[PDB]
Design an enzyme around this catalytic site. Structure first.
Site, mmCIF file in Angstrom:
data_model
loop_
_atom_site.group_PDB
_atom_site.id
_atom_site.type_symbol
_atom_site.label_atom_id
_atom_site.label_comp_id
_atom_site.label_asym_id
_atom_site.label_seq_id
_atom_site.Cartn_x
_atom_site.Cartn_y
_atom_site.Cartn_z
ATOM 1 N N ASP A 34 3.465 -1.439 7.088
ATOM 2 C CA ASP A 34 3.999 -1.207 5.705
ATOM 3 C C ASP A 34 5.433 -0.625 5.726
ATOM 4 O OD1 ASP A 34 2.975 1.064 3.011
ATOM 5 O OD2 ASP A 34 4.248 -0.709 2.922
ATOM 6 N N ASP A 220 9.771 -4.624 1.352
ATOM 7 C CA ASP A 220 8.458 -3.970 1.410
ATOM 8 C C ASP A 220 7.341 -4.898 1.883
ATOM 9 O OD1 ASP A 220 6.170 -2.520 1.287
ATOM 10 O OD2 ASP A 220 6.225 -2.128 -0.851
#
Ligand SMILES: CC1(C)Cc2cc(Cl)ccc2C(N[C@@H](Cc2ccccc2)c2nc(=O)c3cnccc3[nH]2)=N1
Ligand SMILES: [Zn+2]
Ligand SMILES: [Zn+2]
Ligand SMILES: [Zn+2]
Length: 390
Positions: A34, A220
């Site tokens: 992440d 992201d």
């Protein structure tokens, strides 16, 4: 880097994970990669959607930091106990480091049914780490403790199973074609970048460019969609509707709440426009564009009902926290997180999802005489202002 190629797996809409080992003897877990958060946290107690988890009692190298951490999301939460243990990446660099690990002891809506990751690897910077920026993130310990170069790169390839590569400490030239273009990391917290122009099938959205980055734009890998600030999102949908006006879809489709379908193999890809985001270049006045196909932002969802139909979800959605370049965007590209040089590179991915007549692209330079600063300055709260950073 041949050992690291193809070290990612996942399910469509549930991100990409890499194997990691925690503890001694090593416990192997599948860990979400992440780039939008900065904690390393692993499931550490039973949960109905996990069949394994970090057991701190079985690790002879585990040390309790005696401090809890609570991490709320808009949609859920995790919480747990901070500690440190030895960590390695079996299909990454040949090293083991002592890292902070949050052992997740309770969570809500975080571990999803039939999702196969047991933890999250936050690759972003210390500034956004919880409980505060003094908890050193994994990648910072990695670099400080070993000779691994301060960079990693992601090839995310497009429930259906997905694959890709996280190359830690390098750039693997087999994973892309063509030129690699770098945009500055505007600030080291998220992987924040600046979009200077947006076009939909070659037509300029013509907004003040600060609107593109309100209140930030970030890269992201923990977000599925391309998410766009509200005003940008509305202008984009208006423009995509105009291009595809041979088809009248319901409103739920544009909200991402309903699939739309055509007969097997008949989808009219050619009526959906490409989207180009122009990112600020390393040289003032330069930008380059990344160009997304409809096949990236219309995501196939296998219909349990209608049998010989291809059905799709619209994977551009609204944001109230800036532009989010999630899987929808990253899946076109090999993305280099060049932390040492404070920049992000994009190249056409060796696994991009092509189309008959058009291709995901990375192209530049485009020069402007126009000065304008497209960055947005987030209103500084008294809370931020007061905290000392010693
Ligand atoms: C990193 C991670 C796990 C953090 C997270 C925490 C919680 Cl509690 C609930 C969902 C997510 C989440 N959501 C992603 C989809 C996801 C889920 C699992 C693994 C990887 C990605 C997301 N993407 C969107 O486009 C999106 C769009 N709108 C609202 C919420 C959204 N949420 N990503
Ligand atoms: Zn399993
Ligand atoms: Zn002080
Ligand atoms: Zn600080």
């Amino acid at each position: 880097f041949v050992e690291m190629v193809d070290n990612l797996r996942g399910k469509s809409g549930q991100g990409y994970y890499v194997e990691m080992t925690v503890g001694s003897p090593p416990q192997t877990l599948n860990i979400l990669v992440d780039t939008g958060s900065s904690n390393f946290a692993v499931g550490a107690a039973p949960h109905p959607f996990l069949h394994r988890y970090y057991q701190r009692q079985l690790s002879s190298t585990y040390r309790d930091l005696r401090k809890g951490v609570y991490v709320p999301y808009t949609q859920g939460k995790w919480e747990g106990e901070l500690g440190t243990d030895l960590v390695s990446i079996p299909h990454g660099p040949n090293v083991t480091v002592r890292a902070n690990i949050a052992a997740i002891t309770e969570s809500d809506k975080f571990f999803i049914n039939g999702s196969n990751w047991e933890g999250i690897l936050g690759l972003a910077y210390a500034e956004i780490a919880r409980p505060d920026d003094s908890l050193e993130p994994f990648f910072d310990s990695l670099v400080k403790q070993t000779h691994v170069p301060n960079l990693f790169s992601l090839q995310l390839c497009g429930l259906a199973s997905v694959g890709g590569s996280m190359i830690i400490g390098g750039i693997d030239h087999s994973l892309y074609t063509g030129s690699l273009w770098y945009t500055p990391i505007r600030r080291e917290w998220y992987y924040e970048v600046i979009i200077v122009r947006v076009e939909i099938n070659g037509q300029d959205l013509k907004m003040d460019c600060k609107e593109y980055n309100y209140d930030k734009s970030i890269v992201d890998s923990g977000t599925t969609n391309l998410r766009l600030p509200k005003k940008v999102f509305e202008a984009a949908v208006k423009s995509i509707k105009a291009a595809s006006s041979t088809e009248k879809f319901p409103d739920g489709f544009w909200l991402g709440e309903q699939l739309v379908c055509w007969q097997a193999g008949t989808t009219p890809w050619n009526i959906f426009p490409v989207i180009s985001l122009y990112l600020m270049g390393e040289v003032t006045n330069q930008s380059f564009r990344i160009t997304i196909l409809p096949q990236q932002y219309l995501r196939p969802v296998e219909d349990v009902a209608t049998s010989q139909d291809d059905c799709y979800k619209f994977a551009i959605s609204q944001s109230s926290t800036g532009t989010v370049m999630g899987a929808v965007i990253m899946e076109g590209f090999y993305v280099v997180f060049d932390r040492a040089r404070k920049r992000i590179g994009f190249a056409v991915s060796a696994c991009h999802v092509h189309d008959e007549f058009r291709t995901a692209a990375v192209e530049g330079p485009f020069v402007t005489l126009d000065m304008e600063d497209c960055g947005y300055n987030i209103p500084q709260t008294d809370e931020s202002r007061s905290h000392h950073h010693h």
